[PDB]
Structure formats: structure tokens, C-alpha cells
Amino acid sequence: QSFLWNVFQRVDKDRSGVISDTELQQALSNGTWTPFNPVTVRSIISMFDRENKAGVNFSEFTGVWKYITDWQNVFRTYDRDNSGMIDKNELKQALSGFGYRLSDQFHDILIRKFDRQGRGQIAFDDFIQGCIVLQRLTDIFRRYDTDQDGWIQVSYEQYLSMVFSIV
Amino acid sequence: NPPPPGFIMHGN
Ligand SMILES: [Zn+2]
Ligand SMILES: [Zn+2]
Ligand SMILES: [Zn+2]
Ligand SMILES: [Zn+2]
Ligand SMILES: [Zn+2]
């Protein structure tokens, strides 16, 4: 009750009562001393921001703290070598939760697309944003995956519909 | 010696 509350305080610098995007960012660690991915921060904020205030109050921050510790739980387990980074061999073991098993060097496309560190591995902040994009893509896929076998057959319009429904 | 992934509480 105060545990979640005394986390909210230490992250609220200007004491306005709202965790700003900048506040949550520099109160977060990707584990590489580089600034936490602002795109990742912006996403987690807007997910639990309900009055457009581009931030979260204690009510809204509870969802944020839960949403971020649940991701650290995921990151902690698949980071078996415990280097603070998820490598390709550890990525295969991680992205298994999306249903269809993916090819081995499809994990080289994902790691090229979402790694900002550029060291051929995936950090915690980039891991969250990557899955956010991935979940966004699979919701679009599941609409046409009625068959439920990981394969869809769509038209030209439906394809364009899928592309422009990314937002 | 960077802070572990996620929320950083004071004292690293
Ligand atoms: Zn604030
Ligand atoms: Zn690792
Ligand atoms: Zn490794
Ligand atoms: Zn089928
Ligand atoms: Zn230290």
C-alpha cells in the first residue's frame, strides 16, 4: 500500500504528483548506463495514461509498476547467463511465448531491428519495446488467423489494411 | 557496475 507508494515518490522529482516521461526514464535502467529507451518509456506511459497528461499518477503508476516488473520477470529468466543482455541463443528461448516457433535466423532480423546498443544483443529497454511491436503485429495477424495454424491467406486490401492498421 | 534492469532504487 505504501510500497507501491514510496516507489512513486522516488520517481516523482518535481513533486507535481505526476510521473513525467523524463522522470520515469532516468529512474529506469536498461542495465547499460545508456538512457532508457524513450520510445519504450513513451509507450508504457501512454498505455496507462488515461487523461492525456502524458504521465501517470499513483493510480496510473500501479499499472506501470506491475507492467514493468512483469517484464523484468521475463527478462530475468531468459537472461540465464546473467549479463544484463539477452543474446540470440537466449532470444529464441524468450520469444517462445508468441505461439508459433520462429526460424533460427529470424532472430537475427529481430535483433537487428530493435537493438539500439548495436552490440549484437538485446537490452531490457529494447526487449520491452520489441515485444510491444511484436504483440501489435500478432493481434493483426490473429484477426486473419481464424484457422489458428500460424498461416493466413489475405487479399491486397486486407494486406494494406494490416499495414495501415499498425497505428 | 550499472544498475540492474528495471527500477533503480537509491544505492545502485
Ligand atoms: Zn513528476
Ligand atoms: Zn545473456
Ligand atoms: Zn550471452
Ligand atoms: Zn490453414
Ligand atoms: Zn554502483
Numbering used by the authors:
A (entry chain A): 25 to 191
B (entry chain C): 1 to 12
Could you share sentences copied from the article?
ALG-2 (apoptosis-linked gene 2, gene name: PDCD6), a 22-kDa Ca2+-binding protein, contains five serially-repeated EF-hand motifs (EF1 to EF5) and belongs to the penta-EF-hand (PEF) protein family, including typical calpains, sorcin, grancalcin and peflin (see for a review). ALG-2 binds one of the two mammalian isoforms encoded by different genes, designated Sec31A, in a Ca2+-dependent manner and is recruited to the ER exit sites. ALG-2 binds Ca2+-dependently to a variety of cellular proteins, most of which contain Pro-rich regions, and binding motifs are classified into type 1 (PPYPXnYP) and type 2 (PXPGF). Sec31, conserved from yeast to humans, is a component of the outer layer coat protein complex II (COPII) and is enriched in the endoplasmic reticulum (ER) exit sites, from which cargoes contained in COPII vesicles are transported from the ER to the Golgi apparatus.
The co-crystals of des3-20ALG-2/Sec31A 837–848 obtained in the presence of Zn2+ belonged to space group P64, and the crystals were twinned. The crystal structure was resolved at 2.4 Å resolution. An asymmetric unit of the crystal contained two ALG-2 molecules (chains A and B) as a dimer and two Sec31A peptides (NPPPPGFIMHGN, chains C and D). Three Zn atoms (yellow spheres) are found in the Ca2+-coordinating sites in EF1, EF3 and EF5, essentially and two additional Zn atoms (cyan spheres) are found in the vicinities of EF3 and the Sec31A peptide in each chain. The clustered Pro residues (2PPPP5) form left-handed type II polyproline (PPII) helices. The peptide ligand binds to a hydrophobic pocket designated Pocket 3, which is separated from the ALIX-binding pockets, named Pocket 1 and Pocket 2 (pink and yellow surfaces). Pocket 3 (orange) is formed by residues that are present in EF1 (F27, V31, V35, L48, A51), the EF1–EF2-connecting loop (L52, S53, G55, W57), EF2 (F85, V88, W89, I92), EF3 (T93, Q96, F99, G108, M109) and EF4 (F148). Several Pocket 3-forming residues interact with the Sec31A peptide at the side chain or main chain carbon atoms of the peptide by hydrophobic interactions (common contact residues in both chains B and D are indicated in bold face: A51, L52, S53, W57, F85, W89, I92, F148). Hydrogen bonds are formed between chains A and C (S53OG/P3O, S53O/G6N, S53N/G6O, A51O/I8N) and between chains B and D (S53OG/P3O, S53N/G6O, A51O/I8N). The Sec31A peptide binds ALG-2 at a hydrophobic pocket, designated Pocket 3, formed by residues that are present from EF1 to EF3, except for F148 (the loop in EF4). This pocket is completely separated from Pockets 1 and 2, which are formed by residues from EF2 to EF5.
